[PDB]
Amino acid sequence: QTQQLHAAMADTFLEHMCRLDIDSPPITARNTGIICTIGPASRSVETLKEMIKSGMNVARLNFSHGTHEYHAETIKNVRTATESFASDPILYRPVAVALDTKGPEIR
Amino acid sequence: LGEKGKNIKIISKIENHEGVRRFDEILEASDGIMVARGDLGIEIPAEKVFLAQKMMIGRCNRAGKPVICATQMLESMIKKPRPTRAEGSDVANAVLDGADCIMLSGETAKGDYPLEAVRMQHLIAREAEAAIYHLQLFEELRRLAPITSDPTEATAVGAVEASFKCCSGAIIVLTKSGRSAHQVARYRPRAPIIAVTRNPQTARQAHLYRGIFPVLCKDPVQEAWAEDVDLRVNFAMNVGKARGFFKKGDVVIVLTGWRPGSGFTNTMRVVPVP
Amino acid sequence: QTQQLHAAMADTFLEHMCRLDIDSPPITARNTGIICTIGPASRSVETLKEMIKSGMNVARLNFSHGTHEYHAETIKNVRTATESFASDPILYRPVAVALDTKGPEIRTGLIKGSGTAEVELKKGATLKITLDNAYMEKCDENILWLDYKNICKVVEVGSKIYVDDGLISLQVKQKGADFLVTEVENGGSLGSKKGVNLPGAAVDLPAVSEKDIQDLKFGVEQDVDMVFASFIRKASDVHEVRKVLGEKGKNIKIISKIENHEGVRRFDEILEASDGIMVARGDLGIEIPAEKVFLAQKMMIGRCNRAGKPVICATQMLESMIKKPRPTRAEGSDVANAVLDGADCIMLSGETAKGDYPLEAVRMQHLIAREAEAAIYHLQLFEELRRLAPITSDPTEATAVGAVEASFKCCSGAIIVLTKSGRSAHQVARYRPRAPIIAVTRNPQTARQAHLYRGIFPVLCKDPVQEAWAEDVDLRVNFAMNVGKARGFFKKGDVVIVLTGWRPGSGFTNTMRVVPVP
Amino acid sequence: QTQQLHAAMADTFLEHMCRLDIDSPPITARNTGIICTIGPASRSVETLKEMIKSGMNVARLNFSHGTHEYHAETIKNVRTATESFASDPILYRPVAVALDTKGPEIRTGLIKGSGTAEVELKKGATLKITLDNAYMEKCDENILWLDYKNICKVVEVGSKIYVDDGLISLQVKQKGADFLVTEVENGGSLGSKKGVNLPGAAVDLPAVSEKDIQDLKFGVEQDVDMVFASFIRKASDVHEVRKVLGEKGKNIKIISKIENHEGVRRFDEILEASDGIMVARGDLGIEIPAEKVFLAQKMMIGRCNRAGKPVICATQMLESMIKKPRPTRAEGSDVANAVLDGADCIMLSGETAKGDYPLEAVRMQHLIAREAEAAIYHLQLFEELRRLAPITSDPTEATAVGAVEASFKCCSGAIIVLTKSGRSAHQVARYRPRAPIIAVTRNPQTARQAHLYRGIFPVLCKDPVQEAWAEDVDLRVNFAMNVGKARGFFKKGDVVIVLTGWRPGSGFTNTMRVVPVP
Amino acid sequence: QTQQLHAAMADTFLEHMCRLDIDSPPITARNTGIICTIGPASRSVETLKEMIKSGMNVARLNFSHGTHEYHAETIKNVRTATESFASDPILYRPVAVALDTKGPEIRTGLIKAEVELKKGATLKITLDNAYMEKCDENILWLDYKNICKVVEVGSKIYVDDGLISLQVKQKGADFLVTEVENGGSLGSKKGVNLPGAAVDLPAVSEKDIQDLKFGVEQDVDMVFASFIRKASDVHEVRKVLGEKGKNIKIISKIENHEGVRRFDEILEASDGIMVARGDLGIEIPAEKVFLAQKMMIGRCNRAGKPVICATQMLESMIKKPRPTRAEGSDVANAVLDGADCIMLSGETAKGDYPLEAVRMQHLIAREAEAAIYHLQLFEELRRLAPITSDPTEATAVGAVEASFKCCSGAIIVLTKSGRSAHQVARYRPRAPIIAVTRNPQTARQAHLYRGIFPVLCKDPVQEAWAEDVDLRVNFAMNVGKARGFFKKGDVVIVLTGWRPGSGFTNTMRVVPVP
């Protein structure tokens, strides 16, 4: 009855679809990685702590806008928020930092 | 990036008709791909974007390379605390297509509901992951993956097979560079892949791959290498128990190697949770 | 290098995905039905003419709002627009009329005596819910009246209430005799006469209200093609609609809208009692957690495909197109995935009823559907439909699967089906051919109702009955050849499948012919 | 609980095997063609009448032995027996005549002047092979004469020589000119005029010998239906037989016998050039290691099935039935597996030519064929045949596949096919329906040649040509209905598939009808 | 170019068949077990040495005939021949001993033998014995007491391995009035079959009891139990074998319609199955035997229980040094069907060419094993196998998967009881399963399973368990190298456990051959 195990056992893709069940709860584990773009809504250490708790795995920094000083502060905040959980190694979540380039553009 | 940035992962953003047309050569040269749907949907007709998305996810899954689905996934959540039905659908279908990562842009950068957007991606992903037809997916990945003499690839396919047979709560992988855990992820098990590493960059970079739940071991190096290996396995057991992935008595798959250093993963064990 | 034929030839679904090609153009034919809600953005004869040209197949009338007089005029305008093309029978497109019931809706009243006034609700604030009719037109930030007199019987302390498409959320912290003390969880702007959902609750409202009775009777009078019955929870709800339609409306199709937890749980009995299903994602996505809607959508589409019953995917498919001339990437994806899931029909609501870009929304649905139809993995789909469909003695069913098989084998430009009631064409549609199904009928209702099924391109023959039956049959086949050539589905020399019967009348389809286009 | 319908519905081949049921009886119809070698045990008119009743479809004449006079009499008796049933056209069974050439055989001389005289050969003993015709009649325990002039130039020292279906083996110990000295490795009872095999050697004998010319000429004169051409090594060998048959024999079917290494290696070119293939296991199992024969059998059956060309499985299928009235378990297995492999025809040689139980052998092949035909996993077989057969514009192909699909869907009692040349019926047989294919023809040669294809049950229409073509067509359909009813393939009310064309003449089959049995 | 690897890569079973190649040579390893009936053609130590060399894995002793003294001597000769190779442990092949019971036979009267039978006539069948001394086409008596309770008017009766047919026209009482359906050579105290009838003779006869006890005394590896009709029959054999024979494998012979119908309960109660085609092909129509064979092989493969295909596989080799083409086909198809073992009866017991028969089974098996469409077979076995918590089951499926992925030369399994090796065999890898054991009975019993190449480790137990484990792995590496299964640098799959003792196999390693 859990994690669509009835749908899992179907002999056809069509029967698999037929067996998808809103009353079959998922497992705790979530496999898909979540990448969040950090900006003014999400930049504070305090918001970033909650972002991590909510499931943020990667912090994306968009280099279309903002100075290196601004970005360095964001990265610092990401690291501050991440390391606040380092006290319990069992519960600590690693958090990646991604740099998204401006690339060739027109303005 | 040079020698100093040689371990930084390059994810190529596919943004235009040329990037789509030269996709194979781009993929081979990259560490992974972002389906950059924003620009792509301006560059090519909007009605064709799902074709390029499913083509690139498919080819990445085939190559075992990370693929990100990006742009406007929960766009209305910039202003509203709930997504539209199209947005819930889009997230679920990106996961069902086989995307390793999903992304938020304006929803988290500038929106009024960044935490709700994150939470929603988490809820959808996990529902969609259970809805995957693993039976066909694992058959097709096996049939299409080259036979090689690589012991790690053979071990990693063995581990996923075993995980399906015993309905394991996880696949525990010790890894220095992440490569052994990446090789498991390629075969798309249902169970989470707990990747135990002492390498903090490895732990961070592992989020590029579907199902890799990285854990950074801080514990000091035990005297006997076999004991240091067992310590890291036990660490992953403790994480899994704490996160509610499994309980004492459940079976998990454990991947290790025959000697220290990268490139020697060749051991698969089916072990009870202590 | 056309219609994803390289992807079509793949041995695995994964390889099929790998082969999808943005440089492989679709065929001209579009198989997915387009249902458009008519309202002030789309009501004029002149706009309706463009809708039809842009690909509208069904005109949905939403009976949540408006008088019978208003609806009668809309229906008249739909018919005026449709019949303006009757002059060329080759190009004429039949257009169905669908009545969508109000059903057991819950709505708030007026913010400070106004239809347009809003107040803001802040996270944490007390809002009192009243059923005192005094506050009917006097709603505000502190006192909200809603129209469900039994709300207090069915709600409890700790219940969630959703206002306005579930954007505003309330938590019942204190319950009174004929009032509720709530705390604003998710705040926002509260306006007038907004939809209310009680996801936890067993709502006591009738399946078919007295208003629903009058509306359904009006539908019979107005010769509507189909009913979209709102909030269907159980088979007895369907039977109530069916009884109301009566002998006089026995040929009107009942489409049950699944938009609550009950509707999902009792899906099988509802499906058996209905002519088809709408996945009513709006209410459904408030009634059940938003992250579960795709599960229910794919379950219902799958079960409908298995039953050979029409399934509509509805609500917010191109929502941002209410305000913008282009859709978001999630919306483009949603449309394509509904097609790939198996949906017979895609729908527009606010996008065509009230938005700034109704024709662009219609056009976009047309473009996406056709791209997605070529991306279907027919090789697996047809194998699975065959394996799961009962062996029967029915000659028509045997002729239909044989015709579909034949259409795959010779890569036919179309399956031409002569049909009186539509059944023979429906039976072909169930097996999901790649090629369009040109259904030739003299029955105007049949022509309109045929839009409920994937691939069925109905053509209304208005040539008089020729005395030699064989000549009358050939006339209708030739009519379809002319339509298909004019629409660019095929050219002279191409092969098509032709389905006919051995005698006039209905129930005798048993003949499959592979014929060159003249 | 009939025709292995439970096993038919299994999702896997393994589950299909698990569901095979000894308590599930077969239908009535038997699809696999039965070829019987006629000889002294079976050549009387009276025995031949019973062979036909027992299920013989093809009469094989083996031209390794006997005179033209002897063969002319056999053919006359086959025709007498066949035509004794002509009185009832509904029950008449067409019976084909096949000429099996001697080909480049090597045979020994006569033991001590006699053709039935037998030496027992000793293991380890010495035997001298000579080409000196002085000894051609004087063959004994220490002197054996062969008819292959070039023996010495092609067989080196140490070479293996096999005598009498490989049962006796000799090693080239002493290599000379005009003669050889060998030791008997496998001793045994050596008789007269026994087949010799040189598996190592490139045997340079002509494809078509002067005897073969006289024999093929005789076949043309005798109006044989088909030639089984022995020892085909290459496509130019088939072209030779074809040129020998000439304009006068242009409609005679050439079946290339595959019986040596080179013919397996050059299989594809041979297949393309031939009308079909015989898996000639006897010689093949001496020429290549015995343990490889099943590989070559399954390869050739598979490639023939893929090409839609007839394949015969031949040699030792029920060998022990020469002396015993029941087969061994290996023989029951072999028959069932040849059918399961996909052979169009199974064959009897010594079992019918010279054995003590020819009718029992025929009967047994009929019982096993029909049991094995029910055990076919049609679900996988039909899926694979579809996936592997080219998409073409050919209307007849599309109709034939439509037909087979339809026949599976409605569990039809038969596929009725009007055919002039047989081709439309051949095209249905290629896709392997479970139901018999009743091929209605006025062409008596077509009716006989149709036994080469799995499932084709030919019926020769004798009724005169009706003036109205539509009436003449319906007359032939009704004839097939009458045959099916009489043979118990189906009853009134059952459904059948009917294939016809849009105009008279070959090449216009495009019409598939699902029709009730009147 | 080797091992039908081109056919292996086909997307369809049809294309797989199209790609079968007579010029694609098999590997050295032969996976199918060869069971040989020992008799006068094969009984000498010297012939038995050649039997073993030629590929015989199991010596079947048929207890329908011969004294305990005779059988004891045969067993002694089998052991003498087997142990002559013990000098090289790397090359030694274990050889099992199987006892095939007589079982519940029905018998007739006497001749002071082949008489004339009146095709048509009538024969009086009573239980009192009247025409006891002479057997002529007129009057015949029987040993089966409950004949009339299991056979009705219009139930057929076979005599002398189905040779004489008879239809029941009157009861009964003790009397039976008949018509003759087949003419043949009427013997004396001859075999009787009752097709369709559920025969109520004891599962384990008094003779069977003494035989089964003798088997325990003689340390036989397995019992082939005759005429098994039901699960309670298997339980009876099991109880007779007792504590002392608790490790002896019980293979139920499926001989009649009842055994086929009650197959599932029989299979569950047994260690394995024999498809006993001889008797089966008398009791049920001959044309149905292939259905029952493929049904039983399929169900056994599904259960992971050994299945033997038996009777007339190379019958003409009794008199001829080469088989018929039907016989070559039959052997190949039994292997393709999924059979763990193939058997020789008269071909090795009494024939003129026992060693050629053995050799032929080995050649065919190995060709047929390369022709298996593993791609479909492994997909179907895995889809149909229950999800369980059993660590060894998961390890075994994992090992089989990895063996396919790296095209391994072997799966090495350390096993005490054989179970870990049996669990690998169930998933049908292409590569041989080298089962390393110190248990000589385990080494012998392993021949019942497809692919299991048992090796008996003689080396003494090392004090460090890890060293003792590595020693046994290295022993298997040496065997595989010597037999040409693989060479230094090739990869193999290695299965071990986490602690000594049975039931702990949970470790799969991909290891290079040293």
Ligand SMILES: O=P(O)(O)OC[C@H]1O[C@](O)(COP(=O)(O)O)[C@@H](O)[C@@H]1O
């Ligand atoms: O995934 P990678 O980078 O190849 O690392 C896997 C390696 O980790 C190990 O399990 C443990 O190695 P360390 O003890 O050096 O961390 C090795 O045996 C194995 O080769």
Ligand SMILES: O=P(O)(O)OC[C@H]1O[C@](O)(COP(=O)(O)O)[C@@H](O)[C@@H]1O
């Ligand atoms: O799909 P339906 O309603 O059964 O109608 C199909 C019918 O149409 C026909 O092709 C033509 O019928 P008419 O001539 O009455 O229009 C019949 O032969 C066939 O039975």
Ligand SMILES: O=P(O)(O)OC[C@H]1O[C@](O)(COP(=O)(O)O)[C@@H](O)[C@@H]1O
């Ligand atoms: O299999 P063939 O040789 O193409 O013959 C099939 C032909 O038989 C028919 O059904 C009947 O033709 P005839 O009336 O000339 O015999 C044609 O319509 C069709 O083209």
Ligand SMILES: O=P(O)(O)OC[C@H]1O[C@](O)(COP(=O)(O)O)[C@@H](O)[C@@H]1O
């Ligand atoms: O197949 P079985 O009988 O369960 O035996 C497998 C056992 O063999 C071993 O690999 C070695 O055991 P021993 O040291 O007792 O011989 C164990 O770890 C494992 O449990």
Ligand SMILES: [Mg+2]
């Ligand atoms: Mg609604």
Ligand SMILES: [Mg+2]
């Ligand atoms: Mg020959």
